[PDB]
Amino acid sequence: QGMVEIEIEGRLHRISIFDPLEIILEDD
Amino acid sequence: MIKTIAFGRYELDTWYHSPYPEEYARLGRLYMCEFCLKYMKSQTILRRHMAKCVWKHPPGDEIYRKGSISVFEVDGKKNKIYCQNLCLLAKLFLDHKTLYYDVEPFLFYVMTEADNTGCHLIGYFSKEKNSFLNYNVSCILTMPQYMRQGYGKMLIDFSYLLSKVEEKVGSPERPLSDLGLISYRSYWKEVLLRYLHNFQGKEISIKEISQETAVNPVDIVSTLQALQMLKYWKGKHLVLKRQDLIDEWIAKEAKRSNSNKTMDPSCLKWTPPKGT
Numbered sequence: 237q238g239m240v241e242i243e244i245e246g247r248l249h250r251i252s253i254f255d256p257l258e259i260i261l262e263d264d
Numbered sequence: 265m266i267k268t269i270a271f272g273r274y275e276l277d278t279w280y281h282s283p284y285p286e287e288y289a290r291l292g293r294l295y296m297c298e299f300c301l302k303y304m305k306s307q308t309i310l311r312r313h314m315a316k317c318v319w320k321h322p323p324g325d326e327i328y329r330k331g332s333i334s335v336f337e338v339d340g341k342k343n344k345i346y347c348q349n350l351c352l353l354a355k356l357f358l359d360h361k362t363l364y365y366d367v368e369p370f371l372f373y374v375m376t377e378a379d380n381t382g383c384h385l386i387g388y389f390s391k392e393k394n395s396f397l398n399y400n401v402s403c404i405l406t407m408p409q410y411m412r413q414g415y416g417k418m419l420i421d422f423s424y425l426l427s428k429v430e431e432k433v434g435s436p437e438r439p440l441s442d443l444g445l446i447s448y449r450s451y452w453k454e455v456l457l458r459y460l461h462n463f464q465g466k467e468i469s470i471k472e473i474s475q476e477t478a479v480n481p482v483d484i485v486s487t488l489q490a491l492q493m494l495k496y497w498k499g500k501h502l503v504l505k506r507q508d509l510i511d512e513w514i515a516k517e518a519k520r521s522n523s524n525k526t527m528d529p530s531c532l533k534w535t536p537p538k539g540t
């Protein structure tokens with residue numbers, strides 16, 4: 237139960253600390 | 265009321281009041297021994313002191329040394345007088361300083377630059393010996409004559425170096441001043457872009473970055489937000505490896521190395537004190 241909140245582009249979001257997040261360059 | 269300080273070869277304007285005794289605070293100018301930090305009333309008194317004073321560097325153990333740059337670990341219970349002097353001196357430039365009298369529960373990491381007269385004070389950070397909130401810095405200062413030369417970032421970097429060696433995740437003590445938040449955000453950016461510049465995998469977790477860097481997950485996520493590197497596409501969150509941001513970072517980090525303003529882990533001889 238470690239989670240963070242904040243907003244991205246007028247949209248509140250919530251992110252896990254243990255889930256792998258995907259890295260990208262410039263695609264879409 | 266105190267307006268300036270004589271400190272070695274410098275004369276320093278004070279930012280905020282510090283609770284020196286009224287016998288001293290009544291004066292406009294305070295004279296300080298740049299090595300033991302005793303405060304005195306006049307140039308004459310200082311000159312006599314400098315003839316008697318044996319100290320040519322902070323007390324405590326020198327735990328970092330790369331040529332002329334050193335860090336000394338001072339225990340507030342072992343060198344109460346020095347640390348109290350250090351604390352009154354820092355309050356001349358801190359708007360909100362945690363405490364001044366009971367320095368015993370703190371360690372002070374005092375950074376110096378050596379020349380042929382001794383080891384001169386650059387700056388310091390204090391640290392709770394046992395912090396419930398896992399703070400790895402309590403206060404941090406670069407002396408005014410040294411500000412904006414990259415020593416603050418070396419001090420921050422060093423505080424996380426200690427955390428790594430302790431196998432801990434650290435964070436600065438809240439609240440952060442404006443100068444501190446600017447410096448921490450700069451350091452966090454540097455550390456984040458460096459990790460990502462070196463990672464070749466295509467997925468990473470916050471905890472992974474945190475455990476490698478000793479930086480707290482919340483500050484990592486917060487830096488990612490500041491860099492606008494947390495995007496949302498389809499269902500989950502992704503990290504955006506911005507070319508320019510790392511492009512500017514290699515140019516910036518080139519200039520950093522060029523000026524030698526870096527802490528070097530192999531120059532740390534340290535085992536955590538009285539807790540391992």
Ligand SMILES: CCCC(=O)SCCNC(=O)CCNC(=O)[C@H](O)C(C)(C)COP(=O)(O)OP(=O)(O)OC[C@H]1O[C@@H](n2cnc3c(N)ncnc32)[C@H](O)[C@@H]1OP(=O)(O)O
Pocket residue numbers: 357358359401402403404405406407410411412413414415416417418436437438439440441443444446447450
């Ligand atoms: C941390 C626990 C809770 C606290 O105690 S917070 C209080 C922090 N201490 C203070 O506020 C006392 C007064 N200020 C200081 O001692 C120093 O400014 C402090 C925070 C240690 C930074 O030391 P410096 O040696 O100047 O830092 P540095 O050369 O490594 O550069 C760090 C980044 O900060 C930037 N910056 C530094 N001073 C600035 C200024 N006056 N105005 C605007 N921006 C400034 C500097 O450009 C650098 O950023 P960048 O790398 O260029 O992006």
Ligand SMILES: [Cl-]
Pocket residue numbers: 378379380381
């Ligand atoms: Cl010299």
Ligand SMILES: [Zn+2]
Pocket residue numbers: 297298299300301302313317318319
């Ligand atoms: Zn002295």
